[PDB]
C-alpha cells in the first residue's frame, strides 16, 4: 500500500 506519492506506474 505504502510508496512515494510521486511514484507513477506509467513512469518506468
Amino acid at each position, epitope marked *: *500500500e*505504502r*510508496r*512515494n*506519492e*510521486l*511514484q*507513477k506506474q*506509467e*513512469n*518506468r
Partner: antibody
Amino acid sequence: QVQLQESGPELKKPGETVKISCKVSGYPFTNYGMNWVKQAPRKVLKWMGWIDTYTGDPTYADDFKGRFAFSLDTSASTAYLQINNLKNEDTATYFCARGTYWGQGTLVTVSA
Amino acid sequence: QLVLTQSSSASFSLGASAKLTCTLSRQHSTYTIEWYQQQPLKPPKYVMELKKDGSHSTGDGIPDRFSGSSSGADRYLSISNIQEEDEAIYICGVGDTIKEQFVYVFGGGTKVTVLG
C-alpha cells in the same frame, strides 16, 4: 487538515551539523514516503531523495550522497534530515514533501 | 538523461489565457508530470498531475481556471482568465523507476507575470 510542520530556522558555522524535523498530521504517517527538497537562493527546487516511513530505508539523489541522512520517529510521526560537515553552499530552505503536501520550509544559514 | 525543459519567464494580460510548456526529453515522452506553483513568501503548492493523453487531476485549493493538455513530449499548464494572484513561478516535476529505484527531477521553472 493535512499538515507537515517543520522546525524553525537554523544558524550554523561551517563544519557543524544540523538536524531538521518534519511533524506530519492529518493522515497515516507510514502510508506515504517523505521526500526532501532543497531550494537554494537561486530558488530552483532540487530533489534530495526520499525515505520509506515504515522501514526507514532512504534513497539519496546523486548530489546528496555522503553528508545527508534521513531518519524517522514513526511513533511521533516525525521525519528528520541531518546534514553533516556543513558548507556555505548548504545555505538553502529545506522542505519535506509528501508530494501533494509540503512543509513550510526550514531556513538553514551556514555562516562563520 | 531525465530532463524537463521550461521557459525562464512569460507575461500575460489580466483575463487572458496562459499556456506554459514543460518538455520531456526524447525518451520518457509518454511520462506523467506534476505541476507546482510557487508564490514569493510561500512553500511550493501542488497544482496537478498531467498524463501523456492530456488527462489531468488538480490538487486541493486549485481553482477551475487551472487545466492541463499534452501533445507528444510537451506538457501544458493552461491558466484560463488569469488573475493577478496567479503571479508565481510554475515548476514541473517528473519521477522515474529503474530496477525498483525511484528518482524524481524538477524543471528550472517559469516565472509568470500578470500585467494590467
